[PDB]
Amino acid sequence: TDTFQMFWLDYCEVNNTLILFGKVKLKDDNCVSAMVQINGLCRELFFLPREGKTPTDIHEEIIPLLMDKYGLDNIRAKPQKMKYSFELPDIPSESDYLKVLLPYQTPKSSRDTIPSDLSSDTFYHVFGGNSNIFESFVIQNRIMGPCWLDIKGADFNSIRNASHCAVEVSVDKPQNITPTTTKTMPNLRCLSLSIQTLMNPKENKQEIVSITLSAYRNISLDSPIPENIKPDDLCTLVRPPQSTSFPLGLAALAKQKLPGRVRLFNNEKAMLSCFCAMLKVEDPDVIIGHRLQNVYLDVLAHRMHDLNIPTFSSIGRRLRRTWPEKFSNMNHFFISDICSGRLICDIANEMGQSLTPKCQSWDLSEMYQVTCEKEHKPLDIDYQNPQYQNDVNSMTMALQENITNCMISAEVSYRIQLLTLTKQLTNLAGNAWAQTLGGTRAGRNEYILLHEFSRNGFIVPDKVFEPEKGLHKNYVLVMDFNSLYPSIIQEFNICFTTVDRNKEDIDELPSVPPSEVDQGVLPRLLANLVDRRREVKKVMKTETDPHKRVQCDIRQQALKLTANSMYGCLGYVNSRFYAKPLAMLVTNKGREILMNTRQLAESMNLLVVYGDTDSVMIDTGCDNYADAIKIGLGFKRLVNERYRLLEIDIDNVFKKLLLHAKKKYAALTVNTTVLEVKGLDMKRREFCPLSRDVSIHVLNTILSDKDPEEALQEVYDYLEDIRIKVETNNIRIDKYKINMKLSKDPKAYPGGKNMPAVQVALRMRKAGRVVKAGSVITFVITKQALSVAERAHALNEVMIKSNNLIPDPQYYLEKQIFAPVERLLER
């Protein structure tokens, strides 16, 4: 009521200040964007006194020297008792440090940081010298992810023309900002982007041809997001891929065939200028897309740089007139920085992939099928193909393809709940939402410990069973063992605080602490996450309201993911909290448990088909779903009885299983039984529809509910019928077709005599027709000595009977039918 309130989403660093971007509510209950410039932030340095000296001795030595070097009239400093329990050898468990507050903003040498190994006769180590400004703020003020912030003493007249936000304010000190307990959040303005590019052979540059923008202005994460939500505004921007003008009648045809607005531009520079203007006015909190992080944002950024778009900064929320001077492998940092203020929701990055394990390539069409169970056949659009510069039909189809991708990306991101889950993960880890969305696990792993330890007066550090190959005729269950390590850490009280280890030699194996030692920080945290998860699952059993129930499920998953990710803290080599002695201690107990899990399985007359620290596959010996699940639960109880904290679950159910490796198999999963293939090249372009039809039919018959002979004879009968059908050419010519795209001119292909597509193309040239880079050649290997490449002819030519061209039975029965079936039907 007296304080400025804001829901913070993202941040950036500039001039040793911390800017928070967020939302503010207006008198009409509508939320607009806002930014807060936070001054007066300081590093918390801790100086460790030598055995004889004291914190006061330190005060008298460096405070004057620090004042002079940084040009400060005074420096807040006081003794403080802190604890250390990490990897540095000669630092005691508890000591009296001199806590020093060094402002990020200093008159002199602000950019220079104090090294940990600063020479002195009063102290021999210094912590926090290289602290990050965002890290300091978040830790000192106990900020746990995106939330509401009470900001007192906000200055509404200090900041001028600094952002693309509606409200700009500042504070003189970070203590003026505190988090509130409000559990709800404001609606987000989401903007889905789809970009189509053009490869420029001359400069090897990726240029932009079109951009589609789909706006969703009131996405609410408090309630579930309605399926197939329609955008409030849809707009497509485009420029000519070849000439300076479009085909005739494009605008009229677009108005007639395409949804939303379509804006035409004479060049790319005008299009990108318009794009930036639209971002500014739309002011999205979230930018959704497919492969934005590692592909399209880089293209977009560099093209804006190339064409010198003055309003490029609107991609983020901080206003810049110039690009970073060094804008190289560190382009990712510059782009990430310039986007600050708008969250990047990329369904195809590491974070997005982790939520969609059922995928394999994570292509837009594949994800749409997996997550939404809807089919969309992708069109390969190559704007090098001249047809787009003159054929108005072609252009319209291309734009339609872009518009569809833009809305599929949005729908997928809502369906897999990428925003709400990452938010919960961010609230649990206390890091930045953007870091969760675009980073690995390491980030979340790091901040959850930074918060836990600093809250309990601790100084934090400075920044297998081989697969049984073959067909399994009985139900096989994949048992989830992801809680293995976190249950080990908890059971055996493994922590940085409890395990004595040789810090001189990290290869020396330590021992688990005796029961007398109190629960450490890491096990206590894991125990809590596990308890909170139960508190939520209990509530679900009673909850009737689907809205609250769905919210519970999200919270529940978030807690599970946080706990199952804790091992990375001490396991990952490049972790701020890496500890090899601890990693070894947890990995060894992991082997003991899995080895015994095998014996437990065999004690139930079960066979382990495959296993690792993440999952164990067991053959139930049953040919019935009900029987199989009962066996699964029995094994679940058996494993929990021997390991009270280890709770495993049934992840997959294979009625039949053809196994090669963990991610290379074919099987009938149960959710209704369905065919599921993994790690096997099924939809490979090298193979024609006939070969794919045959391979599919072969699998279905093997995994069929029939005996081996009567079913395998069905295969032989099928192949024989196929062979006679091929030899007598009674199959549709389409089924023999093979596609092959030309990346360059067929004449410029070195070794084109071996490539069937290059031969077909060159033949079309010598005739008269035109074919350049970007043309897809569809051909058939015809019967005739001539090479296979010389016997290859365009599909449409073989379709005409008067041409007397027939498919070569030898090639198709051998290379297209025998070879694939041989690799599939071996065991």
Spatial separation of the C-alpha atoms in residues 425 and 418, rounded to whole Å = 11
CA distances from 152 to 4, 149, 173, 356 (A): 6, 10, 10, 42
Sequence-separated (6 or more) residues with CB below 8 Å from residue 208: 195, 196, 197, 198, 239, 268, 271, 272, 299, 300, 303
Q: Give me the residues paired with residue 207 across strands.
A: 198
Q: Distance between CA atoms of 823 and 800, rounded to whole angstroms?
A: 34
Task: List the structure tokens of 349.
Answer: 């990055």
Helix (H, G, I), strand (E, B) or coil at 768: coil
Q: Are 261 and 238 in contact (CB under 8 A)?
A: no
263 with 238: CB under 8 angstroms?
yes
Amino acid making up residue 431: N
> 569: closest CA among 445, 439, 435?
445
- Mapping DSSP to helix (H, G, I), strand (E, B) and coil, where does residue 608 land? strand
Proportion of the chain in helix, strand, coil states, percent, rounded to 5: 40, 20, 40
The span from the CA of 737 to the CA of 689, in Å, is 7
Per DSSP, which regions of 201-282 are E strands? 205-219, 233-238, 261-264
807 near 733, Cβ under 8 Å? yes
CA–CA separation, 256 and 393 (whole Å):
12
Say if CB 789 and CB 760 are below 8 A apart. Answer: no
Distances, alpha carbon 719 to alpha carbons 691, 726, 730, 793, in Å: 11, 10, 14, 26
Residue tagged 């904290």 (tokens): 645
Dist. CA 225–CA 140, nearest whole Å: 35
Q: Exposed, middle or buried by CB within 10 Å (0-12, 13-18, 19+), for 805?
A: middle
Beta-ladder partners of 65: none
> Measured in whole angstroms, how far is the alpha carbon of residue 52 from the centre of its chain?
52
Distance, in Å, from the CA atom of 546 to the CA atom of 533, rounded to the nearest integer, reads 18
CA 396 to chain centre: 32
Outline where 604-688 has alpha helix (H).
Answer: 625-642
Closest by CA position to 552, among listed 424, 671, 661: 424
CA–CA distance, 102 with 70 (Å, rounded to integer): 9
Per the CB < 8 A criterion, the answer to whether 117 and 97 are in contact is no
Q: Which residue, among 675, 595, 603, has the nearest Cα to 635 in the 3D structure?
A: 603
Burial 36-60 (b: 16+ CB within 10 A, else e): bbbbebbbbbbbbbeeebebebbbe
The answer for residues whose C-beta is within 8 angstroms of residue 490's C-beta and 6 or more apart is 523, 526, 527, 530, 645
Do 68 and 201 meet the contact criterion of CB atoms below 8 Å apart? no
How far is the C-alpha of 329 from the C-alpha of 599, rounded, in Å? 50
Dihedral sign from CA coordinates of 546, 183, 418, 288: positive
What residues contact 370, with CB distance under 8 A and at least 6 apart? 356, 358, 359
How many other C-beta atoms lie within 10 A of the C-beta of residue 626?
8
Residue 614 exposure: Cα atoms within 13 Å on the Cβ side: 2
Question: How large is the angle between the packed helices 250-257 and 392-415, nearest 10 degrees?
Answer: 40
In 3D space, the residue among 625, 556, 564, 639 whose CA is nearest the CA of residue 596 turns out to be 639
Which residue in 342, 1, 20, 25 sits closest to 159, CA to CA?
20
Q: What 3-state class would DSSP assign to 364?
A: helix
Give the number of other CB atoms < 10 A from CB of residue 76: 12
Please name the residue that has the structure tokens 């830790």. Answer: 139
Provide the 10 A C-beta neighbour count for residue 787: 12
Alpha carbon distance 780, 773 (integer Å): 20
Burial environment of residue 767 by CB neighbours within 10 A (0 to 12, 13 to 18, 19 or more) = exposed
Which residue in 781, 800, 799 sits closest to 789, CA to CA?
Answer: 781
Residue 124 token pair: 């021999």
Which two structure tokens, joined as six digits, stand for 317? 């929320």
The answer to whether residues 47 and 98 touch, using CB atoms and an 8 Å cutoff, is yes
Stated as kind and residue range, the H or E segment containing 664 is strand 664-670
Domains of the chain: 1-41+145-184 (2.40.50.730), 42-81+83-143 (3.30.70.2820), 186-417 (3.30.420.10), 418-463 (6.10.10.100), 464-518+567-681 (3.90.1600.10), 519-565 (1.10.287.690), 683-728+809-827 (1.20.1280.310), 729-808 (3.40.1820.20)
3-class SS of residue 8: strand
DSSP-assigned beta bridge partners for residue 25:
31
Strands 77-83 and 177-179: unpaired
* Residue position matching structure tokens 């993994």: 678
As a whole number of Å, the end-to-end CA separation of the chain is: 74
- The radius of gyration of the chain's CA atoms, rounded to the nearest angstrom, is 32
Whole-Å CA distances, 754 to 739, 742, 796: 15, 14, 22
Q: Are strands 286-289 and 188-200 parallel, antiparallel or unpaired?
A: parallel
Give the residue from 264, 605, 646, 347 showing the smallest Cα distance to 485: 646
Q: Enumerate the H helices of 543-651 as residue ranges.
A: 546-563, 567-571, 580-603, 625-642
Helix (H) or strand (E) holding 478: strand 476-480
| Paired sense of beta strands 476-480 and 607-611, if any | unpaired
3 state DSSP class of 160: coil
Q: How many CB atoms lie within 10 A of CB 427?
A: 18
What does the block give as tokens for 717?
A: 């009968």
Nearest residue to 231 via CA among 195, 194, 263, 189: 189
The residue among 351, 323, 348 whose CA lies nearest residue 408 is 348
Per-residue H/E/C for 183-203: CCCCCEEEEEEEEEEEEECCC
Most distant CA atoms of the chain, gap in Å: 103
**Contacts (Cβ under 8 Å, ≥6 apart) of 119:** none
Burial class (CB in 10 A: 0-12, 13-18, 19+), 599: exposed
Instruction: Kindly provide the resolution of this structure in angstroms, with one decimal.
Output: 2.7
Q: What number of helices (H) and strands (E) belong to the chain?
A: 25, 26
